[PDB]
């Protein structure tokens, strides 16, 4: 059994948390 | 810059609130209360929060003359300070005395 | 340190939502604030983004949407009705911008009444075009969302 | 009943917070009102509450007095 | 039936928004 | 599907969405019993995940979630 | 009373066709005269009104119109032919407006040559858009002029 | 006689490719050089010419073209694909023009950043319109290139 | 029947209006 | 299959050209 | 017009090339060499081609200072002219000497 769309959406919520922290780190590295 | 004090008056320490000036202070009118304090002490802002004023001459820009006259009655009823003078600042930089108009 | 004010008398706060440099880069290079742009192009880009997204709720959620309706023959009426709906919403926004313009704006943009009318005009063309472009990509989402070359012969 | 019970100075203070929220929202403080948002006046608050009370009264009873009598059969 | 539906679209939808825009011009432009 | 027969069926990396493919390449990168074109994995991760004891796609999914949150913690 | 002249050397009459206050409100707030408008938006609104009505005579009266032709198979050809006809009439108007602009205009507008070219540009986009909009609403007049919900099932 | 140089220190040669008077009338009345035009109209006309020709290679040469495909049901997909392809090429040109505009141009045009943004906006609207107009004439070239009146009855 | 109809459309319809517009530019612009 | 192909169009085609346009704005504007 | 010699200098007879000035001479800087010839004599251009200098003071506008210096060294190495003065020309018309500085 493969992975449905709801768990891919949960992985995208987790990646959004990761993307926010990457977006904060890259800008404060740019200072 | 746009809210520069007259020479002789120093700014009280306030951390900035959201209740202060709006676009009317840029385009129509704003107001300025200038008083003299003998020490550094803590007064409630008329727009929310608390500020600390220093010994000497302190000036504060407000959106509204009733905000200034409420600040003035707070200084009288708490700190016995009666030399507040209230100016109306126009956006070109003109300053006129509107309390005490008698002197 | 994070919440400062610069001008402590103006009723505003310098906060990481306000004062971090990537949001200031995003907002100051969103079209209405992007430097070196005529108001017409600004309204055009705002219109294209808006009119592209405005097609979507009308075609998924509107009165012509179901799988219980009549073939996908109703789907072309759905795309056409959603396209007209997004254009008339852009027309109402154009009416809003140009009634704002024609009574004589006072605002922090340095647009005149003529500048906001350039914005209104760009808004209308960009919005109707964004509606039309979203409708064309919605018509083309059959071959877009699969490998079209492969089921077709020759 | 909102206009009838709740009165003016609540709504005036609420509109002052709304005025602050509009002048500090980017992409939107560039759109300005020509007439300043204030709360409705005291007499206007009474009149708009009366107008809604009256419109709702008449349409509620007209709907009743027509559909209950037409639905007798 | 005996209906002009385009007339309903004009005078109940288009023309009142037309009229409110015209009264907006009447009540907001100075002179 | 690879745990049921590790010696015949080939490891799969990920699937392909490239709109440039014609019909020959669409059927060429599709395996037998598959429903579209994929990449056949040549990196040994299935053998890695078998020896370290992953037996389900759900354990692979919680591994994916844990590595995204561990990356989020390090940023 | 009704007819004055208010400069009797100038060969004109001030008449209730001329000088009624709602007629002056109408004419003075048609888009070529409505104050606070950049010439492009004046052209845009003039084009939209004109290009919208220009689709009509070509579709009802053109070479592809009748009930003795081949089904509504020719009706899509009628709508497309009238659409192209109204856009090319708008293109001829654009050519007219921009030949007016490029030879250097002297008129009671305070448009320049550049201002009349903005009017020509807005005329073209608005006119072709008004043709396209009248074509889409003419495609939609089947469901528009009936209660569409009610014959379709489910 | 034909290869003059007028400013001999400026590295130029006034040649009949350069200094024939009909070539100067052609180039100096091309839209970017045509006097009396606002930059928006120049961009609009450049866009319409480019977007009209840009449809063609995508519909003849693109991935949906052949007589060995599935009836002429695929030809509507071909016309739609070429239409979206020409509009996205115009969008990329608009992006190019406005990345040129937003960074501050220094050129022989007397356009500012705002004038080049007007040109970018006109380029986008004209190019998408030229693509749409070429798509509509390529929906109509069956009846356009025959005597359509004549094979229809009544 | 050997016909190029698009060429008839170019030089009998489009190109004469093109030519009158170009001649209008030739006869109505100063210097 | 289990594909989000619209995401492939966004992040492999649209978002790189988006990013190069944004980086062009970063590297070519004075202050 | 845009490239005007100082009064006293005459232009050499050249049929004008494509190696010469570009937009930088309009917008950033250009350079000007003036020399003194006793006769009309044939010299190679630094930008390609051949020109003839007339008797008197000859002025020539070049894009770079090295083109002017190479022209001066060619005039020394072939035709024995050592009074070339190389100037830097701004787009507003302000003139300064850059060769020789010492005199
Ligand atoms: C808020 C409550 C609500 C909601 C969610 C809906 C929703 C809907 N109604 Mg509706 N309706 C309502 C109240 C509501 N109605 C009321 C009070 C009435 C009056 C009695 C009606 C009368 C009505 C009628 C007659 C019909 C509907 C219909 C519909 C459907 C489609 C209409 C449409 O596309 O609009 C368009 C939507 C938009 C133009 C945009 C939507 C707003 C966007 C998505 C907000 C996005 C914000 C964003 C996320 C945040 C910013 C992001 C940024 C910071 C990056 C839709 C599902 C139609 C239908 O067929 O029913 C199924 C229909 O014919 N309604
Ligand atoms: C006391 C009551 C009151 C009254 C009579 C007015 C009256 C007016 N206001 Mg004000 N205003 C008020 C309170 C009031 N306001 C308050 C409390 C605020 C917040 C501080 C504002 C802030 C405000 C601003 C910024 C402006 C006005 C303006 C106006 C004028 C036009 C109305 C309008 O814009 O349509 C507004 C319509 C709605 C609110 C209905 C919302 C419907 C939704 C959005 C769907 C509509 C669809 C549409 C196509 C949008 C979809 C596209 C979109 C998703 C992009 C009008 C005379 C404008 C003006 O001065 O003209 C030049 C103007 O710029 N007002
Ligand atoms: C030879 C002359 C001629 C001919 C043959 C036509 C033929 C036609 N005209 Mg027309 N027209 C003409 C001259 C002509 N017109 C002139 C001189 C004017 C004044 C400039 C107009 C202005 C006009 C308008 C405003 C409309 C037509 C419409 C039509 C179509 C109506 C029949 C139909 O399909 O029902 C279908 C009926 C509809 C689809 C109407 C639906 C309801 C509409 C959309 C409400 C909004 C209409 C409103 C009045 C316009 C906005 C006003 C603005 C100020 C806000 C028909 C093809 C209609 C049309 O173009 O259809 C797309 C229509 O809306 N004409
Ligand atoms: C004036 C006389 C006249 C009239 C009424 C017509 C009418 C017609 N001709 Mg025709 N024709 C004429 C003379 C005329 N022709 C002449 C002299 C020749 C040359 C020999 C031709 C050669 C010809 C050909 C070859 C064809 C026609 C065709 C047609 C039909 C459609 C063409 C069309 O849509 O045009 C477009 C119409 C417009 C762009 C707008 C019309 C004008 C508007 C409605 C005026 C509105 C003013 C308004 C009411 C007042 C302002 C209002 C404001 C104050 C509010 C149509 C019924 C076609 C056909 O198929 O026949 C059936 C066809 O192929 N004609
Ligand atoms: C130069 C070599 C070359 C040529 C002629 C082609 C040609 C073609 N390729 Mg291709 N390709 C190439 C190299 C080339 N490719 C390379 C290096 C790659 C990378 C590996 C690809 C990968 C590729 C893919 C994936 C696909 C193609 C496809 C195609 C076809 C349509 C694409 C299209 O419409 O573009 C658009 C063309 C334009 C926007 C304009 C063309 C340029 C104009 C005509 C120049 C005009 C100049 C003018 C005459 C002079 C000025 C006139 C003025 C002075 C008056 C087409 C026949 C598609 C296909 O289906 O194959 C059949 C397809 O899917 N190619
Ligand atoms: C960082 C490693 C990585 C790599 C190389 C890929 C590669 C690929 N992915 Mg995947 N993806 C990843 C992480 C990765 N992904 C993660 C962690 C998730 C869970 C949220 C996903 C969610 C995902 C979905 C739903 C899909 C893909 C798909 C694809 C394929 C097409 C590209 C695409 O649109 O996806 C877009 C991916 C996202 C929008 C989220 C990715 C988030 C990652 C972590 C950002 C990467 C940042 C990176 C570490 C920084 C490197 C910078 C460097 C350039 C200097 C492609 C082969 C498609 C496919 O299956 O092909 C047929 C598909 O539909 N990915
Ligand atoms: C919320 C919500 C939803 C989600 C919708 C969404 C919005 C889902 C999320 C979609 C996305 C697009 C999440 C983004 C993942 C991007 C990531 C991890 C980036 C890493 C970049 C990195 C490490 C950088 C390295 C870098 C550093 C640091 C530098 O210093 C410079 C270089 C470089 C840039 C390379 C759902 C609908 C799905 C569910 C319901 C729901 O509520
Ligand atoms: C004077 C008067 C009158 C008359 C009127 C008339 C004459 C009418 C009309 C009318 C009309 C004539 C109307 C119209 C209209 C229109 C419209 C409403 C339009 C539109 C459009 C659009 C919206 C478009 C869009 C677009 C663009 C622009 C771009 C791209 C494409 C598209 C499509 C998207 C009477 C006596 C009766 C009354 C009083 C007043
Ligand atoms: C903030 C942000 C975000 C969000 C975003 C969003 C919200 C989205 C989106 C989006 C969108 C919303 C997009 C859009 C678009 C669009 C387009 C791309 C358009 C277009 C168009 C066109 C192209 C048109 C054209 C035309 C014209 C104009 C004229 C004529 C007609 C035609 C059609 C041709 C996030 C958080 C996530 C991340 C970060 C940032
Ligand atoms: C140099 C020359 C030549 C060449 C030429 C050429 C190259 C060609 C061409 C051509 C072309 C290339 C043409 C074109 C065109 C076009 C057109 C005509 C267009 C259009 C359009 C339109 C009309 C659009 C519209 C619109 C809009 C804008 C918006 C909305 C949508 C629409 C669609 C409506 C020769 C040698 C031969 C001769 C001499 C001169
Ligand atoms: C996921 C994954 C991965 C990664 C990994 C990592 C990087 C990590 C990790 C890690 C982990 C997963 C871990 C863990 C752990 C656990 C623990 C650590 C536990 C526990 C418990 C307890 C209960 C304890 C208790 C105690 C204490 C408290 C202290 C000491 C002593 C006693 C025992 C008492 C890999 C790539 C390989 C593959 C696939 C996926
Ligand atoms: C030209 C024109 C009219 C355009 C239409 C303008 C547009 C877009 C919507 C129309 C306005 C709307 C919908 C609301 C605003 C009314 C408002 C300030 C209500 C708050 C308020 C409430 C709730 C009370 O209970 C009350 C009680 C006693 C005294 C005062 C108040 C009072 O102030």
- Contact (CB, 8 A) for B87 and B32: yes
The phi, psi pair for D56, rounded to 5°, reads -70, -40
How far apart are alpha carbons G148 and E5 in whole angstroms?
Answer: 12
- Strands of the sheet containing K30-37, edge to edge, are K56-62, K30-37, K85-89, K95-99
Peptide bond just before K100 cis, omega within 30 deg: yes
How far apart are alpha carbons G65 and G77 in whole angstroms?
Answer: 9
Asked whether G62 lines ligand 3 (CB < 6 A), one says: no
DSSP string of G75-91, one letter each residue: HHHHHHHHHHHHHHHHH
Residue among H97, H96, H114, D28 nearest C30 (CA)? D28
How far apart are alpha carbons F56 and F62 in whole angstroms?
Answer: 10
Lining ligand 4 with CB less than 6 A are: G 54, 57-58, 61-63, 89
How far apart are alpha carbons C30 and C18 in whole angstroms?
Answer: 15
Q: Residue B41 to residues B7, B32, B46, B81, B83: CA-CA distances in angstroms? A: 22, 20, 16, 12, 16
φ/ψ bin of H46: left (φ > 0), alpha (ψ from -120 to 50), beta (otherwise): alpha
The resolution in Å comes to 2.4
DSSP string of H7-23, one letter each residue: SSSBS--B-TTTS-HHH
Q: Buried b / exposed e across K51-75, counting CB within 10 Å, b at 16+?
A: bebeeebbbbbbbebebbbebbeeb
Q: What angle do CA D64, D68, D72 make, to 5 degrees?
A: 175
Longest dimension (CA), chain G: 74
How far apart are alpha carbons F9 and K13 in whole angstroms?
Answer: 85
Peptide bond just before B100 cis, omega within 30 deg: yes
How far apart are alpha carbons D61 and J14 in whole angstroms?
Answer: 60
Locate G21 and state its tokens: 């206050």
Q: Are strands K56-62 and K30-37 parallel, antiparallel or unpaired?
A: antiparallel
How far apart are alpha carbons C24 and C30 in whole angstroms?
Answer: 10
How many residues are present in chain A?
31
Residue among K29, K25, K95, K99 nearest K68 (CA)? K99
- Angle (deg, nearest 10), helices H39-61 and G113-139: 40
Q: What angle do CA I20, I25, I26 make, to 5 degrees?
A: 90
Residue of C36, C44, C152 lying closest to H113 (CB–CB): C36
Residue among C46, G118, G41, G120 nearest H40 (CA)? G118
- Contact (CB, 8 A) for G69 and H153: yes
DSSP string of I3-29, one letter each residue: --HHHHHIIIIIHHHHHHHHHHHHHHS
- Contact (CB, 8 A) for D28 and D35: no
Q: Are strands K30-37 and F38-40 parallel, antiparallel or unpaired?
A: unpaired
3-state helix, strand and coil shares in percent for chain F, rounded to the nearest 5: 40, 10, 50
Q: How close does chain E come to G26, measured CA to CA in Å?
A: 10
How far apart are alpha carbons G54 and G47 in whole angstroms?
Answer: 10
Q: How far is the CA of H88 from the centre of ligand 9 (A)?
A: 12
- Contact (CB, 8 A) for C4 and C18: no
The phi, psi pair for H140, rounded to 5°, reads -105, -5
How many CB atoms are located within 10 Å of the residue B2 CB? Answer: 12
Locate F21 and state its tokens: 């493919």
Lining ligand 7 with CB less than 6 A are: A 9, 12-13, 15-16, 18-19, 22, 25-26, 29
In the numeric block, the tokens 């877009």 are attached to: C144
Locate E4 and state its tokens: 């002009």
Asked whether F25 lines ligand 11 (CB < 6 A), one says: no
- Residues in a beta bridge with F43: none
How far apart are alpha carbons D16 and D37 in whole angstroms?
Answer: 8
Asked whether D52 lines ligand 12 (CB < 6 A), one says: no
Give CA torsion, residues K50, K52, K56, K61, to 10 deg.
-40
How far apart are alpha carbons H131 and H137 in whole angstroms?
Answer: 10
Locate G142 and state its tokens: 């089947």
Locate K27 and state its tokens: 């917008």
> Does the beta carbon of I7 lie under 8 angstroms from any beta carbon of chain G?
no
Sign of the dihedral defined by the CA atoms of residues B45, B48, B50, B52, in that order:
negative
Contacts of K101 (CB under 8 A, 6+ apart): none
Locate H122 and state its tokens: 């006109």
Helix or strand run (H / E) with residue K79: none
- Contact (CB, 8 A) for C47 and C90: yes
How far apart are alpha carbons H147 and H137 in whole angstroms?
Answer: 15
Give CA torsion, residues K52, K55, K61, K64, to 10 deg.
80
- Contact (CB, 8 A) for H40 and G121: yes
- Contact (CB, 8 A) for K87 and K31: yes
Locate G141 and state its tokens: 């007049």
Q: Provide, as residue numbers in chain H, all residues whose Cβ is less than 8 Å from the Cβ of G69.
A: 152-154
Residue among C123, C115, C114 nearest C95 (CA)? C123
Helix or strand run (H / E) with residue B56: strand B56-62
3-state helix, strand and coil shares in percent for chain J, rounded to the nearest 5: 75, 0, 25
How far apart are alpha carbons F19 and F39 in whole angstroms?
Answer: 15
Nearest ligand for residue B23 CA: 2
I5 and H146: CB-CB below 8 Å? yes
Helix or strand run (H / E) with residue D49: helix D42-70
How many residues are present in chain J?
31
Q: How far is the CA of E21 from the centre of ligand 6 (A)?
A: 50
How many CB atoms are located within 10 Å of the residue B16 CB? Answer: 19
How far apart are alpha carbons H121 and H43 in whole angstroms?
Answer: 7
- Angle (deg, nearest 10), helices C113-139 and H73-102: 150
How far apart are alpha carbons B33 and B65 in whole angstroms?
Answer: 9
DSSP annotation of C31 reads G
Locate B56 and state its tokens: 């000497």
Q: Buried b / exposed e across C56-70, counting CB within 10 Å, b at 16+?
A: eebbeeeebbeeebe
- Contact (CB, 8 A) for D41 and D72: no
Q: What angle do CA H14, H18, H19 make, to 5 degrees?
A: 70
How far apart are alpha carbons D34 and C107 in whole angstroms?
Answer: 10
The coordinates were experimentally obtained by: cryo-EM
Residue among K78, K33, K93, K95 nearest K58 (CA)? K33
Sign of the dihedral defined by the CA atoms of residues F38, F41, F47, F52, in that order:
negative
- Contact (CB, 8 A) for K68 and K31: yes
Interface of C with F in 86-145 (CB under 8 A): 144
φ/ψ bin of K93: left (φ > 0), alpha (ψ from -120 to 50), beta (otherwise): left
- Contact (CB, 8 A) for C5 and C12: yes
- Contact (CB, 8 A) for A11 and A3: no
Which of G26, G53, G57, G82 should be mutated for ligand 4, with most atoms under 8 A from CB? G57
Helix or strand run (H / E) with residue C8: none
Locate I21 and state its tokens: 């517009």
Residue of J28, J30, J31 to mutate when probing chain H, most H C-beta within 10 A: J28
Helix or strand run (H / E) with residue B52: strand B50-53
Where are the alpha helices (H) located in chain G, listed in sequence order? 21-27, 39-61, 73-102, 113-139, 141-144
Residue C48, CB-side half-sphere exposure with 13 Å CA sphere: 16
How many CB atoms are located within 10 Å of the residue H54 CB? Answer: 21
Q: Residue E5 to residues C80, C109, G141, H10: CA-CA distances in angstroms? A: 19, 43, 10, 72
Residue K80, CB-side half-sphere exposure with 13 Å CA sphere: 2
Contacts of G16 (CB under 8 A, 6+ apart): G2, G23
Locate F55 and state its tokens: 């037996």
Sign of the dihedral defined by the CA atoms of residues E3, E8, E10, E15, in that order:
positive
How many CB atoms are located within 10 Å of the residue H3 CB? Answer: 12
C21 and A23: CB-CB below 8 Å? no
A11 and F68: CB-CB below 8 Å? yes
Contacts of E15 (CB under 8 A, 6+ apart): none
- Contact (CB, 8 A) for D39 and D61: no
Helix or strand run (H / E) with residue G7: none
How far apart are alpha carbons K48 and K16 in whole angstroms?
Answer: 10
Q: Which atom of ligand 3 is nearest to the CA of E18?
A: 55
Where are the alpha helices (H) located in H1-112, listed in sequence order? 21-27, 39-61, 73-102
φ/ψ bin of K56: left (φ > 0), alpha (ψ from -120 to 50), beta (otherwise): left
How far apart are alpha carbons B42 and B53 in whole angstroms?
Answer: 6
H56-62 contacts, C-beta under 8 A, 24 or more apart: H56/H82, H56/H134, H58/H82, H58/H85, H58/H86, H59/H138
Residues of chain F with a following break (C to N over 2.5 Å): none
How far apart are alpha carbons G99 and I22 in whole angstroms?
Answer: 9
C107 and D31: CB-CB below 8 Å? yes
How far apart are alpha carbons G104 and H35 in whole angstroms?
Answer: 9
Where are the alpha helices (H) located in chain C, listed in sequence order? 16-19, 21-28, 39-61, 73-102, 113-139, 141-144
- Contact (CB, 8 A) for B63 and B45: no
Residue among C120, H111, C34, B6 nearest G31 (CA)? C120
The phi, psi pair for K43, rounded to 5°, reads -125, 145
- Contact (CB, 8 A) for K77 and K65: no
Locate H103 and state its tokens: 């960074």
DSSP annotation of C109 reads S
In the numeric block, the tokens 């993307």 are attached to: A19
How far apart are alpha carbons E19 and E9 in whole angstroms?
Answer: 14
Q: How far is the CA of H135 from the centre of ligand 5 (A)?
A: 19
For chain D, how far is it from start to end, CA to CA, in angstroms? 36
Residue among H56, H64, H54 nearest H93 (CA)? H54
- Contact (CB, 8 A) for B38 and C26: no
C37 and H113: CB-CB below 8 Å? yes
Locate J31 and state its tokens: 């202050």
φ/ψ bin of K39: left (φ > 0), alpha (ψ from -120 to 50), beta (otherwise): beta
- Residues in a beta bridge with B36: B57
Q: Residue H80 to residues C154, G75, H59, H133: CA-CA distances in angstroms? A: 20, 21, 9, 12
Locate E12 and state its tokens: 């109940």
DSSP string of K15-78, one letter each residue: ---SSSB-HHHHHT-EEEEEEEESS-EEEE-TTSSEEEEPSEEEEEEESSHHHHHHHHHHIIII
- Contact (CB, 8 A) for J28 and H96: no
How many CB atoms are located within 10 Å of the residue H110 CB? Answer: 7
Q: Residue B77 to residues B12, D59, G131: CA-CA distances in angstroms? A: 19, 57, 74
């Amino acid at each position: 059994m493969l992975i449905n769309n709801f768990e891919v959406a949960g992985a995208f919520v987790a990646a959004l948390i990761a993307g926010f922290f990457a977006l904060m780190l890259s800008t404060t590295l740019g200072k | 810059q746009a809210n520069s004090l007259p020479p002789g008056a120093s700014s009280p320490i306030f951390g900035g609130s959201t209740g202060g000036l709006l676009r009317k202070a840029l385009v129509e009118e704003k107001y300025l209360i200038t008083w003299g304090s003998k020490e550094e002490q803590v007064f409630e802002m008329p727009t929310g929060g608390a500020a600390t004023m220093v010994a000497g001459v302190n000036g504060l820009y407000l959106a509204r003359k009733e905000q200034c006259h409420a600040l003035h009655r707070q200084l009288v009823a708490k700190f016995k300070i009666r030399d507040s003078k209230i100016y109306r600042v126009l956006p070109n930089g003109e300053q006129t005395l509107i309390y005490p108009k008698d002197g | 340190g994070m919440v400062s004010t610069d001008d402590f008398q103006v009723g505003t706060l310098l906060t990481p939502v306000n004062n971090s440099p990537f949001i200031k880069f995003f907002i100051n290079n969103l079209p209405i604030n992007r430097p070196g742009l005529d108001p017409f192009f600004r309204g055009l880009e705002v219109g294209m983004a808006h009119g592209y997204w405005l097609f979507g709720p009308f075609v998924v959620l509107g009165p012509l949407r179901l799988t219980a309706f009549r073939p996908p023959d109703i789907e072309q009426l759905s795309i056409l009705a959603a396209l007209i709906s997004a254009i008339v919403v852009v027309v109402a926004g154009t009416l809003a911008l140009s009634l704002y313009a024609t009574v004589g704006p006072d605002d922090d943009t340095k647009f005149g009444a003529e500048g906001w009318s350039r914005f209104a005009g760009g808004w209308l063309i960009g919005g109707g075009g964004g509606a039309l472009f979203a409708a064309l990509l919605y018509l083309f989402r059959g071959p877009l969302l699969v490998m079209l070359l492969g089921i077709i012969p020759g | 009943f909102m206009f009838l019970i709740s009165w003016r100075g609540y709504w005036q203070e609420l509109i002052e917070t709304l005025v602050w929220a509009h002048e500090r929202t980017p992409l939107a403080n560039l759109v300005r009102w020509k007439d300043k948002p204030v709360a409705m006046s005291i007499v206007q608050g009474r009149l708009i509450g009366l107008a809604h009370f009256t419109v709702g009264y008449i349409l509620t009873y007209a709907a009743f007095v027509i559909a209950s009598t037409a639905g007798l059969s | 039936m005996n209906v002009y539906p385009w007339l309903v679209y004009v005078t109940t939808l288009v023309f009142p928004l037309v009229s409110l825009a015209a009264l907006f011009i009447l009540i907001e432009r100075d002179t | 599907q690879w745990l049921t027969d590790p010696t015949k069926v080939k490891p799969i990396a990920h699937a392909i969405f490239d709109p440039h493919f014609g019909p020959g390449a669409v059927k060429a990168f599709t395996p037998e019993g598959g429903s579209g074109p994929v990449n056949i994995m040549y990196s040994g991760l299935y053998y890695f995940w078998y020896t370290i004891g992953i037996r389900h796609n759900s354990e692979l999914y919680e591994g994916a979630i844990f590595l995204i949150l561990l990356a989020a913690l390090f940023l």
